[PDB]
Amino acid sequence: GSQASS
Amino acid sequence: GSQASS
Amino acid sequence: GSQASS
Amino acid sequence: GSQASS
Amino acid sequence: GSQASS
Amino acid sequence: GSQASS
Amino acid sequence: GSQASS
Amino acid sequence: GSQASS
Amino acid sequence: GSQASS
Amino acid sequence: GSQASS
Amino acid sequence: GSQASS
Amino acid sequence: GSQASS
Amino acid sequence: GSQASS
Amino acid sequence: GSQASS
Amino acid sequence: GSQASS
Amino acid sequence: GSQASS
Fold first, then answer.
1. CA E4, J1, F1 angle in degrees (round to 5)?
2. Which of chain F's residues have a Cβ under 8 Å away from the Cβ of B4?
3. Residues of chain I contacting L2 with CB distance shorter than 8 Å
């Protein structure tokens, strides 16, 4: 699973 | 699963 | 599953 | 399933 | 704009 | 803009 | 912008 | 911007 | 910017 | 699993 | 910027 | 697993 | 910037 | 596992 | 900048 | 495992 926050 | 927040 | 928030 | 919010 | 495909 | 594909 | 693929 | 792939 | 691949 | 925060 | 690969 | 914070 | 590979 | 903080 | 490989 | 802090 991939989580990306910006 | 993929989560992307911007 | 994919979640995308902007 | 896909969720997209903008 | 939001695009969601499943 | 948000794009979500699954 | 957010892109999420699964 | 956030990109998440799984 | 955030990129996450799995 | 991959987590990326910026 | 953050890049995470797994 | 990979974690990247910036 | 942060890069993490596993 | 890889952790990278900046 | 931080690079972590495993 | 690899940890990198900067």
1. 25
2. 2, 4
3. 4
